[PDB]
Amino acid sequence: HLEKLELHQNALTSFPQQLCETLKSLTHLDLHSNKFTSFPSYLLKMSCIANLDVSRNDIGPSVVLDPTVKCPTLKQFNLSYNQLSFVPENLTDVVEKLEQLILEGNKISGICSPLRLKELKILNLSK
């Protein structure tokens, strides 16, 4: 019954899986300014999460999410500032109710995908 959890500005790497399966009610989770090296991609396998925030870590290129998962409850996916050379190669199939896709400050350089999301409101691709 935690309903929010802030682990930002630590030296955390690789947030564990059984803690996600335990945390069945985090409607908000921010873990930025950490030394994350890749997106765990099971953090979307929680029950009811919005405002997932991984925004100052160093998530390497090819941040593609696992296609065999569904998180139809996100509202913010702040993957800002890390290292992303491309957009997350599966967005239209895992985060289908996303609103604030924030990809600013990354090293995105290529011509982007069709980006077939259906409810974006604040798209950010600066820097």
Checking 109-118 for CB contacts under 8 A at 24+ apart, the result is 109/85, 110/85, 110/86, 112/87, 113/86, 113/87, 113/89, 115/87, 115/91, 116/92, 117/91, 117/92
Which amino acid makes up residue 91? Answer: L
Measured CA to CA, the distance from residue 14 to residue 36 in angstroms comes to 6
Structure solved using which method?
Answer: cryo-EM
Resolution in A: 4.0
Distances (CA, A) of 57 to 22, 32, 35, 71: 24, 6, 5, 22
d(CA 37, CA 105): 17
